[PDB]
């Protein structure tokens, strides 16, 4: 028998709960469970469990260069270390293990650039 609530121990690197009952962590919705929830079309459940309950976070990316930016609302920081005057930061919903994944790819000299979805405008 096991049950957790919304909070508890968290892994240092990925930011996800620990592994199971022994570590007082969470239980796993593995790869095959996302296949089933995608087959059902249950996307708002995937946000709730894999983002709001596992390791979701907010990533900031500059429009003009596609690189990660630095944004802090309180203690106002709004800057890109690649433009510094043409910074156009948009917040993308991400999860921490993916940001760790992109830093692990950049650490191996593979540059990751994120093209954001363009602005759309009604005519006139």
């Amino acid at each position: 028998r096991y049950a957790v609530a919304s909070y508890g121990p968290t892994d240092a690197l990925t930011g996800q709960p620990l592994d199971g009952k022994r570590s007082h962590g969470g239980l796993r919705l593995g790869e095959m469970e996302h296949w089933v929830l995608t087959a059902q079309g249950a996307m708002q459940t995937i946000i709730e469990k894999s983002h709001d309950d596992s390791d979701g976070c907010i990533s900031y990316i500059c429009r003009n260069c596609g690189e990660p930016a630095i944004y802090n609302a309180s203690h106002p920081i709004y800057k890109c270390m690649n433009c510094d005057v043409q910074a156009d930061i948009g917040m993308v919903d991400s999860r921490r293990s993916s940001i760790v994944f992109q830093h692990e790819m950049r650490a191996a000299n593979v540059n990751i650039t994120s093209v954001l979805s363009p602005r759309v405008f009604q005519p006139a």
């Binding site: 596609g66 930061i89 948009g90 917040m91 000299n109 540059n111 979805s117």
Partner: protein
């Protein structure tokens, strides 16, 4: 002030010297890990 966005594509490339020198926020100069309670400034553990 940061508006809502979604990633539409990802471009893969090879990172050179200029990319590292422009993305990097500091330069590792010393091999001291901790001056005290706080991490050493200029080491590999720097708070930057």
């Amino acid at each position: 002030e940061a508006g809502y966005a979604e990633i539409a594509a990802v471009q893969f490339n090879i990172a050179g010297d200029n990319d590292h020198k422009r993305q990097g926020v500091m330069e590792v100069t010393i091999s001291n890990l901790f001056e005290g309670t706080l991490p050493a400034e200029g080491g590999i553990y720097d708070a930057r």
